[PDB]
Amino acid sequence: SNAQITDGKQYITLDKPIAGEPQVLEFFSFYCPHCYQFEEVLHVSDNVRQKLPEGTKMTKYHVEFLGPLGKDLTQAWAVAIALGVEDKITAPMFEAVQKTQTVQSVADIRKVFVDAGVKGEDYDAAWNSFVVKSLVAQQEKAAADLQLQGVPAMYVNGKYQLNPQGMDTSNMDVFVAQYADTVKQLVEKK
Distance of alpha carbon 159 from alpha carbon 13, whole angstroms: 6
Method: NMR
Where are the strands (E) in 36-171, listed by range?
153-156, 160-162
| DSSP 8-state code for residue 7 | B
How far CA 186 is from CA of 38, 47, 132, 158, in Å, comes to 20, 16, 33, 10
Distance of alpha carbon 178 from alpha carbon 182, whole angstroms: 7
State the Cα torsion 171-175-176-178 to the nearest 10°.
Answer: 130
- Contact status, residue 65 vs residue 10, Cβ threshold 8 Å: no
Distance of alpha carbon 149 from alpha carbon 184, whole angstroms: 24
Longest dimension (CA), the chain: 52
Helix (H) / strand (E) element for 106: namely: helix 106-116
Distance of alpha carbon 87 from alpha carbon 80, whole angstroms: 9
* Three-point CA angle 30, 25, 4, nearest 5°: 110
CATH number of the domain bearing residue 130: 3.40.30.10
How far CA 134 is from CA of 65, 79, 89, 129, 140, in Å, comes to 19, 11, 21, 9, 9
Q: Provide the CB-side half-sphere exposure for 130 (13 A, CA).
A: 0
- Contact status, residue 115 vs residue 107, Cβ threshold 8 Å: no
- Quote the distance between the C-alpha of residue 175 and its chain's center: 18
- Quote the distance between the C-alpha of residue 122 and its chain's center: 23
| DSSP bridge partners of 155 | 161
- Contact status, residue 179 vs residue 44, Cβ threshold 8 Å: yes
Distance of alpha carbon 46 from alpha carbon 44, whole angstroms: 6
Distance of alpha carbon 112 from alpha carbon 125, whole angstroms: 17
Distance of alpha carbon 145 from alpha carbon 142, whole angstroms: 6
Domain count for the chain, please give it. Answer: 1
Give the number of other Cβ atoms within 10 Å of residue 163's Cβ. Answer: 19
- Contact status, residue 14 vs residue 147, Cβ threshold 8 Å: yes
Domain extent, residue 37, equals 1-190
- Quote the distance between the C-alpha of residue 20 and its chain's center: 20
| DSSP 8-state code for residue 20 | S
